[PDB]
Amino acid sequence: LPLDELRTFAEVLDRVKAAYVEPVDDKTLLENAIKGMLSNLDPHSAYVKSVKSQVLEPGYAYLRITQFQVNTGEEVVKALNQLRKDNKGRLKGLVLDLRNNPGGVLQSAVEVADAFLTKGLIVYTKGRIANSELRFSADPADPSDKVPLVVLINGGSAAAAEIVAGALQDQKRAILMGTDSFGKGSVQTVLPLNNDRALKLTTALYYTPNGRSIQAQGIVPDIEVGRAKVTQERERPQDSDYQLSQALSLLKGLSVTR
Amino acid sequence: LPLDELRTFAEVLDRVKAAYVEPVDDKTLLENAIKGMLSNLDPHSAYVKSVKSQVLEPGYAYLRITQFQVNTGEEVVKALNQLRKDNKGRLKGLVLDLRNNPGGVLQSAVEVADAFLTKGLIVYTKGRIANSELRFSADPADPSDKVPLVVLINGGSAAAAEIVAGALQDQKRAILMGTDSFGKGSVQTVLPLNNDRALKLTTALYYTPNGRSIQAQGIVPDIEVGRAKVTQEERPQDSDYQLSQALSLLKGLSVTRG
Amino acid sequence: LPLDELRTFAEVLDRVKAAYVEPVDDKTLLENAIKGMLSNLDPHSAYVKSVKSQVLEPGYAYLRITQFQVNTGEEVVKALNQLRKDNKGRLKGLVLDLRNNPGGVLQSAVEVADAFLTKGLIVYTKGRIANSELRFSADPADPSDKVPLVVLINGGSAAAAEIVAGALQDQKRAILMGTDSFGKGSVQTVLPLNNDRALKLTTALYYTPNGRSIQAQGIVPDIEVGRAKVTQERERPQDSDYQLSQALSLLKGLSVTR
Amino acid sequence: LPLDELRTFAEVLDRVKAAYVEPVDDKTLLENAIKGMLSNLDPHSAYVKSVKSQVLEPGYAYLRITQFQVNTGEEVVKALNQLRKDNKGRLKGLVLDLRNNPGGVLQSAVEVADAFLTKGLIVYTKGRIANSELRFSADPADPSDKVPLVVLINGGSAAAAEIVAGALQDQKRAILMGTDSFGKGSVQTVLPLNNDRALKLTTALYYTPNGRSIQAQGIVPDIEVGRAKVTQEERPQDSDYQLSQALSLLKGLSVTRG
Amino acid sequence: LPLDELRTFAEVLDRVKAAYVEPVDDKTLLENAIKGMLSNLDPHSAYVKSVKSQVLEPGYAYLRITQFQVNTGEEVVKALNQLRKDNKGRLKGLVLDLRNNPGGVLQSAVEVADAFLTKGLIVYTKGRIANSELRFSADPADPSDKVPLVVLINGGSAAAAEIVAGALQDQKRAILMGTDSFGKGSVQTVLPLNNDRALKLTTALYYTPNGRSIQAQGIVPDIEVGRAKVTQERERPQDSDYQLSQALSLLKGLSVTR
Amino acid sequence: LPLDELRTFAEVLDRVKAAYVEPVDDKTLLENAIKGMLSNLDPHSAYVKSVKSQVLEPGYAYLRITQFQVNTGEEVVKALNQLRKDNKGRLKGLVLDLRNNPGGVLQSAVEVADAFLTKGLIVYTKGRIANSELRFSADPADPSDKVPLVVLINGGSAAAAEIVAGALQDQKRAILMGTDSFGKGSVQTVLPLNNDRALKLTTALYYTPNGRSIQAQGIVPDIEVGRAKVTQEERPQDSDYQLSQALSLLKGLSVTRG
């Protein structure tokens, strides 16, 4: 309690209480001060099929995560086995479509990452609270069978999708291609107050295994690919999707080289 | 300063100071509380020839108010007399173009309105500061000579333009045509503080003779006419839809009134 | 009988009778002289549902007179009552469509005018014959119930339509809008001759209640409205007809003002 | 002047003088009777290098008559001999372009026709005035050397052009191609009157050797070919449809005639 | 046998036999020398309804020869009688469509020509072999009944079609129109060798009745007509075919003249 | 010269000399036999800065071979070192642009290939002439520093370009991308004759280290990528499809190889 800065604050409040057109009591002024202090501090502070899979070409398959629900992990692993069965053999390449993914259940994201990782860190949260610092490590099981995969990210890829993509990139397990990410990582917790009300505050932030903050740096793809049209000068979705076709061709070339 | 609720405010502030991700000192929190208390209360709170006239048709004339400057009143009356000289007789109809008018000198606004009014109120402000209340009533002289007029108002007509239009409508002196108005009918005074700083606060707001606040209600035209361009298959009504509509209304009103 | 001018005429006739390629007798030359004297004097001299009504909008109705037949008057009055019944109340505005109206029975036109007029003159014919001068006055009954109406006139509006429009305008009962009128008013009578034949001659002309000749001045609308297209910069026939939409909007504005 | 029918005429004139709306004196009525007697009888009654030639193909040549001037005959014969020199031998076919030819000097027309005729009539006029009859017969010399020719006639070919074309057709000397002709085959003489004025009257009209009047029948081509433009996927037949048709007809006629 | 030139040849052959990359024996070198000697000498040397007829307009008929098969002659004569029966009278004009005709049986071509010819030569082959010189004369029977005909030839008109067209043109029996001909006339005979193989050689060439070689000069139409579109400035196939329409109009004009 | 088959050849030649339409002497037949024996055997038989480099992205560089001149080797090594200096460190990927390369100095080709190879064969020629066999093996120095590279080949890449590309592919040193190559892998020597004339004969042909003939097989790229243009919605990969594909393949290969 500074008291002198509180004097300045109360003086401004009294001037407002005196001059404003419509009369205002002390309580509404205090509440507006609180709401604005939170608004000025942090914008987030206050006071259905998940997975679709398909074998797009012989040897090369496509797995899209529309959203991160609770069942999402089991569904991605189910789809992995299903794609292995559809190709009637081991897969030559996989495309993770994580674009247009707002986020969702963090644990489901970590288990989706666990389908591709056998060791190492996945994501960790850092803040100044005791119960904020949280680490997540990969289990020694990956239903992916080390399949080479390229992950697609758009601007509308945020939160859990961004966590998954950053984990897969920092582990050098996947090729990230597409445009940059929404760059938002935060964990708002609701804190209780002695008054009969509570306040929501960002208490910590997500960090990828390397250590880059998702909130600030975002996730930068290893290959930048904007939407574009190719003109030759000589179901099947890649005939209409430029980014998916590019990912498919990159996987094909990687398989040929290897 | 009621210390009992000050306990609640300081406790909320301390909880925020404790929980936020990146540390923030007391000074920035208090400053943001001030800025938000002003911001949450009021969006306005913080811490060229004026008139051009023309006779559109024999008997029907057009008077445009680009802006409200000091010369505006004198120029409006000069233009009124000049238009009476142009038609070589009394006018059958007049159009006040108050569209695209941000406002200007309030006294010039009351002078423009007073050119059309012989009695009654023009505008009055209401607020809680000592010397804010100012009323404006019409003097018993109108250079308009009781000509029937249509006033055109769009969205980009605010402040003094809205005072003039609202006075003309509530006094049942003119017919308002066009779309709705901006609705900026508030006055902001700069108040000084014991600290070497000041705050802008709305201290009063404008009211039309009826009693309707311009700040909220704005001024709603009697006939809604959106902007459009007419193409026949100088004379501005041949190109301006709203002006053509007002002119035709005045002509029909004159014919019926025989 | 000038005799000397007849000498000149007979001399020219004899020269023609002598020199022309194919021989011509005196009779055909005389007949051609007559036909040309009439042709040179006056071009008019020689020798099916009528009414459709509809309530276009709540309060505002539309009455078109395709042509002036004998039943036309009773049909317009029938339609007046029918439109009053359709609106389930008194009418706010009416549009008389008299454009594309060649004319027809004069008495039917005068009775159509009588549906809107309670007193005063309607039309009068003037000529130099005893039985040519004819006056027509309004009866004290108007099924219109003083409804404000706008009358539409095109270039193809002539004869009885022009009489109706001129009567309604000079009585200051209707608003005439659209383009100018065919400007034709005449009354050709057939006159008998001692020879077994007759000649048709314009014997008199129509005059509106004011006294303007319809044949020369035509009928000038109070508001000139050519065909045009409006472009917004933000059954139901007026959505396709520009003149009808303009008349509707003028009636709406007049109702709002009144 | 048969006074008995003059009674009928004067009585009709007096009835008209009595009945017409605006009064008219006897003089204007008599003058209009004169003007109409002439007008109703006859529409014509009231009160640059000439030739260009070219050899289109080896053996086939083209001769155009822009107008009929005095030099026209000499120039046509000069062009005939010159075209024989151009082909270095007798011609297989010739095209007379008489299209877009208003007419001109009649004697030049008979000279142009006489360049193709060795015997028979060319043109003769019939009328009822003393010295009108003029006949034109061919002399036993033709510089054309009996070359088969097609003559082209359009609507804008009148008077002397039609005389030439009709002579060539009725003498079975040429094949006419194109559309129909104007049909202006009448001569107007100015006749003087005892009054200081005169009248234009058609005094005779032209007749082709067959006996058909040019004024009414015109000249109808043996082959109807409308105007058109051909575009291949100088040589004017490559651009002119009618000329190309005439040229191809001449070529085929030459091949068959072997 | 020059022996010295054979020495030069054998010396070049031995140099080739020694230096070439892949080893080659004497036999393949000799065979390649033979094949190239023939290739360098002459490109041709080495080592289904036929007829469709229709009466296109009253009096004017169309006969197309798709190809020259054995039955072709009887079929053209059958079609001649059929067209005479269809028109219900003698024919005014006929169009032979020989364009897009590769050729075929020579005898069938000569009999097709015999349907239009009553005397004279048709085609004769000239070469330096005893049994090569061959003449073909017309029989005194023509089922055409002397009908005037125009023959159409394109660039893709060769061999027997070209023979027919040349015969009809040189006899001055038909009008050839269209573009030039493939210009190919040859008769390759297979000659036997003492070795168990044979060689095909052009042994003679075709000549039209005039004597022009078909192989070199080709067949030049009397009227050149490329594909084009006509634009008026005022089943039935000729409405779509320019060349056929031109041939039809030429036949019509020829009939009118005759 | 085996006279027994010479009998067959001379007999065939005499039969041709006898049967052909136009007479031909023995000399022209023998000359054509020579020209065809060479022509039927072999189509080739009868009787500017070289390198430009650029670093496309941090770590990834581009080296283009316009042509194979003498300076080419020195310039390629200079550019390699310069690109290492440009990236300020070892390169992650390199692109050899061998497209649109006709060939050039063979020794420069072996020098360009030797800049990437440390051991093994580069190219060897096989033929039947005494001094044709020339082999080229790599020296144990490679200025490339084992950088992974993709080589681009199109159809217009022949001769030395194909030698370089084939060496790089068969040594499993580079990944070939693009379309197939020209396939011109043959050497022509001019051989002199006892007559004052000479013959061009292919004396040997090129072979890649695997043993595949370049003349027939050409060089088939490991990844087929046709030419195309990309348009985003200097940096040449932003405009070149094949180069962009190679760059993205190199980037993905680098990420996987971590």
Author numbering:
A (entry chain B), C (entry chain B), E (entry chain B): 41 to 87, 191 to 377, 411 to 434
B (entry chain A), D (entry chain A), F (entry chain A): 41 to 87, 191 to 376, 411 to 435
Anything the authors wrote about it?
Pseudomonas aeruginosa CtpA is a carboxyl-terminal processing protease that partners with the outer membrane lipoprotein LbcA to degrade at least five cell wall-associated proteins, four of which are cell wall hydrolases. Instead, it requires the adaptor protein LbcA, the lipoprotein-binding partner of CtpA, for activity in vivo and in vitro. Therefore, it appears that LbcA interacts with CtpA to assemble an active proteolytic complex, which controls the activity of these enzymes by degrading them. We show that CtpA alone assembles as an inactive trimer of dimers and that LbcA is a right-handed spiral that might wrap around a substrate protein.
We solved the crystal structure of CtpA that was catalytically inactive due to an S302A substitution and found that it was also in the inactive configuration. (A) overall structure of CtpA(S302A) in ribbons, with the catalytic triad residues in sticks and the point mutation S302A in red sticks. The addition of purified LbcA was able to activate the protease of wild-type CtpA but not of the mutant CtpA(S302A). For comparison, the catalytic triad Ser-309–Lys-334–Gln-338 in the protease-active B. subtilis CtpB are all within hydrogen-bonding distance. Therefore, unlike CtpB, which fluctuates between an active and inactive form in solution and can be activated by a protein substrate, the CtpA hexamer is locked in an inactive configuration and requires LbcA for activation.
